[PDB]
């Protein structure tokens, strides 16, 4: 009678082991899937630095990042923060940014682009801008590294399904 309770108990200890092994087993399958997924993003961001270091292919991109950033601000004056190799690029297209922004909103064009005396990391961050208001309290970190990182949140389900479904 009581052999059956203790036999059952040790037979429950037996499948106690069986489940922790079978869980670790799928935890290896899954963490390999991501090791490769984060080497797709590893490729993306070598491309992002290589483009950022272009000054002619990079301008139509750079303009669109400041312009889009301005639509998620909608404030009369903006300060734009950039790397010290993107400032001269902002400088040669200001008119185009205040235009493109004014055209994509009901609002009349932006008064001033103040090219900020702040500087973003040259190691960690490659191209793009932090666009901010007049007082600098609302920021859209609209850098390329940031945009890749935000795209990863929603890009991921699509990729897991086509490669792995």
């Amino acid at each position: 009678g009581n052999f059956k309770s203790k036999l059952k108990k040790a037979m429950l200890s037996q499948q106690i082991t069986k489940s922790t092994i079978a869980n670790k087993m799928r935890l290896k399958v899954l963490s390999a899937r991501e090791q490769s997924l984060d080497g797709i993003f590893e490729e993306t961001k070598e491309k992002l630095s290589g483009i950022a270091n272009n000054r002619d292919e990079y301008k139509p991109i750079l303009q669109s990042l400041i312009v889009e950033a301005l639509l998620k601000l909608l404030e009369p004056k903006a300060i734009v923060k950039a790397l010290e190799r993107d400032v001269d690029l902002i400088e040669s297209m200001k008119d185009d940014i205040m235009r493109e922004y004014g055209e994509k909103a009901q609002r009349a064009p932006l008064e001033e682009i103040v090219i900020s005396n702040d500087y973003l990391n040259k190691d960690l961050v490659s191209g793009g801008v932090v666009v901010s208001n007049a007082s600098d309290k609302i920021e859209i970190n609209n850098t390329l590294e940031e945009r890749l990182k935000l795209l990863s949140e929603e890009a991921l389900p699509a990729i897991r399904l086509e490669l792995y479904g």
């Binding site: 040790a10 082991t17 092994i21 290896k28 390999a32 490769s36 797709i40 993306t44 890749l148 890009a155």
Partner: protein
């Protein structure tokens, strides 16, 4: 009980052995279509995500 503290090692050999086929197709099909997903990632990144 002796098979529940030494015969539970072989159950873990069998969990190691069953994934060495998976860890390798993971890398196969990730390596091929790696390039096709990057191109979509770039047009998307330089536009709204």
């Amino acid at each position: 009980e002796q098979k529940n503290a030494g015969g539970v090692g072989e159950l873990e050999k069998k969990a190691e052995a069953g994934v060495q086929g998976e860890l390798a197709e993971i890398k196969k099909i990730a390596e091929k279509k790696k390039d096709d997903v990057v191109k979509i990632l770039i047009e998307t990144v330089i536009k709204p995500s």
